[PDB]
């Protein structure tokens, strides 16, 4: 979150923010009390995630490719 | 009418698929786990194989047409090779659905094929433009890689030999509907039940396939005489 | 709490028939034996064994005439929840009688087909159809 890089940088060179949190949590706790949906989205988060995992597992066939 | 457990052994028959892909129904045919791969106990195979050949010899004796099948590149050519060695029918590439159940329709393409054989021989194509010719010529090939082998069968083949049950489920199923007895090479992951006489072994070993097919040709060619 | 060890035994047989298993095991007992004893005599089960000392393991060995199991259906009838006693005259015949009805009597556990000729009623245990 604190970047300096001495003298020879000439540019931002800053990814650490977005590489840490930045808005990830800010645009998340920005508003919306939720308290309930979190569970729903938590569940659905990896729910659909397992599909990208599962479907990809047996997706090898032909499609001529 | 027999091949040593050793030739089978060397061929590498006992090697099966990864233990996480097996099919419970093959339980009795498993032997052990080596490097996490299910194995096969030939004490079962050989005798059944003899029985497999045993049933093969009677049918081959009454001249019932034969049919070999394989859609796997690995054992693909193997079939076509032995196919012509036994002078029988085969399906080495694309297994067409209903090649038996809907046979009465497939006959259409066959006579269509016999029309594509003739006009190519005396060369009616020599009178056809690039399109038409290329249109039918290419079409000819499409038929050649599908019905190419069975053009002389004309009717229900009395015997059916197959490789890799599960992957060819279509064929096996049909043979069960039309009452045509089936002989097969079932894998550690393939459901055996579908076929009458199964042969627990390995389908991904080309040399083994040759060992299999060749052995088949042994009793098959003998049945002709 | 295995309220009814009787059906518990039969269920094993029923499910065993579905699994195509050769032998079936279960905690022994006199009554347990009797029922099987009749089975062996009838030809439903291919013999059986009794191995153990204090906790006898009653084990049976199924039979197969064809690809499909022999037993059609076995229904535990007189359940400890609702007992079923029958007067000799009403001794029920299952499947015209081709299917046997294991019945308990004073003269011992036996098939009704024998009971009639024995001329006496009794508590019907289970229909083996």
């Amino acid at each position: 979150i604190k970047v300096r890089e001495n003298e020879p940088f000439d540019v931002a060179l800053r990814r650490f923010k977005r590489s840490c949190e930045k808005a990830g949590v800010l645009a998340e706790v920005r508003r919306r009390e939720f308290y309930e949906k979190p569970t729903t989205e938590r569940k659905r988060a990896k729910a659909s995630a397992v599909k990208r995992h599962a479907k990809k597992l047996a997706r090898e066939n032909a499609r001529r490719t | 009418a027999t091949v040593s457990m050793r030739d089978m052994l060397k061929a590498g028959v006992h090697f099966g698929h990864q233990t996480r892909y097996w099919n419970p129904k093959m339980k009795p045919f498993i032997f052990g786990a080596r490097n996490k791969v299910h194995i096969i106990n030939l004490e079962k195979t050989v005798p059944m194989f003899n029985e497999a050949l045993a049933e093969l010899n009677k049918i081959a004796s009454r001249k019932g047409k034969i049919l070999f099948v394989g859609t796997k590149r690995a054992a693909s050519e193997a079939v076509k090779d032995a196919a012509l060695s036994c002078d029988q029918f085969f399906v080495n590439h694309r297994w067409l659905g209903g090649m038996l159940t809907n046979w009465k329709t497939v006959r259409q393409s066959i006579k269509r094929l016999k029309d594509l054989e003739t006009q190519s021989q005396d060369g009616t194509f020599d009178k056809l433009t690039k399109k038409e010719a290329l249109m039918r010529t290419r079409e000819l090939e499409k038929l050649e890689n599908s019905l190419g082998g069975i053009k002389d069968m004309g009717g229900l083949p009395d015997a059916l030999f197959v490789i890799d049950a599960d992957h060819e489920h279509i064929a096996i199923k049909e043979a069960n509907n039309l009452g045509i007895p089936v002989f097969a090479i079932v894998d550690t992951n393939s459901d055996p039940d579908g076929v009458d006489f199964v042969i627990p072994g390995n389908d991904d070993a080309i040399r083994a396939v040759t060992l299999y097919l060749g052995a088949v040709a042994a009793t098959v060619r003998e049945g002709r005489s | 709490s295995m309220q009814d060890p009787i059906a518990d035994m039969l269920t094993r047989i029923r499910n065993g028939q579905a699994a195509n298993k050769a032998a079936v095991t279960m905690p022994s007992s006199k009554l347990k034996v009797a029922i099987a004893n009749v089975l062996k005599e009838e030809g439903f089960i291919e013999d059986f064994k009794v191995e153990g000392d204090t906790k006898p393991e009653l084990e049976l060995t199924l039979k197969y005439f064809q690809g499909k199991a022999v037993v059609e259906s076995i229904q535990r009838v007189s359940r400890p929840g609702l007992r079923i006693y029958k007067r000799k005259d009403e001794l029920p015949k299952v499947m015209a009688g081709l299917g046997i009805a294991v019945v308990s009597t004073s003269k011992g556990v036996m098939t009704d087909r024998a009971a009639r000729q024995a001329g006496l009623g009794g508590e019907i245990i289970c229909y083996v159809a």
């Binding site: - | 457990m5 060397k10 090697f15 106990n41 690995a74 070993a205 080309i206 | -």
Partner: protein, 156 residues
């Protein structure tokens, strides 16, 4: 006894195989398992742009995340003139650092990695830069990194 023969199969025990089928862009080698492996011509091709085998030849094959083990032999003409490559640290022991360079473990002593700490020196574990190589060892299947190249990896 069937189990005896296999019991005598392990006692008969990188893979050594024979070439039987050669269809352009694909090579078939026999090993003795449930399936015969298939090796891409990229491993049997020389620097001139041709092949070096034929049907009936007994070649070596140790199993495209495996063909690299026998593909590193094509990177020799590069390390002969200080070929700049790319890698990333993943292992660490006592003063010794293991870097994954093209799949070869590299050696980096802490002579300069850890000395006279002026601040929070945590920019080591998790760094992905570009290193330079000067000398290579094909006898120890390893590639020791230089030392002066620190003037490039640290602040490129």
């Amino acid at each position: 006894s069937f189990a005896q023969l296999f019991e005598e199969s392990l006692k008969e025990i990188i893979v050594r195989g024979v070439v039987v089928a050669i269809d352009k862009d694909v090579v078939l080698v026999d090993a003795g398992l449930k399936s015969e492996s298939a090796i891409p011509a990229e491993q049997f091709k020389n620097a001139q742009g041709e092949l070096e085998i034929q049907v009936g030849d007994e070649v070596d094959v140790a199993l495209e995340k495996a063909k690299r083990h026998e593909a590193w032999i094509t990177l020799e003409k590069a390390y002969e003139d200080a070929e700049t490559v790319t890698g990333v640290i993943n292992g660490k022991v006592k003063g010794g650092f293991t870097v994954e360079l093209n799949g070869i473990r590299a050696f980096l002593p802490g002579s300069l990695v850890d000395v006279r700490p002026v601040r929070d020196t945590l920019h080591l574990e998790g760094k992905e830069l570009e290193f330079k190589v000067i000398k290579l060892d094909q006898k120890r299947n390893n590639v020791v990194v230089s030392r002066r190249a620190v003037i490039e990896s640290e602040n490129s």
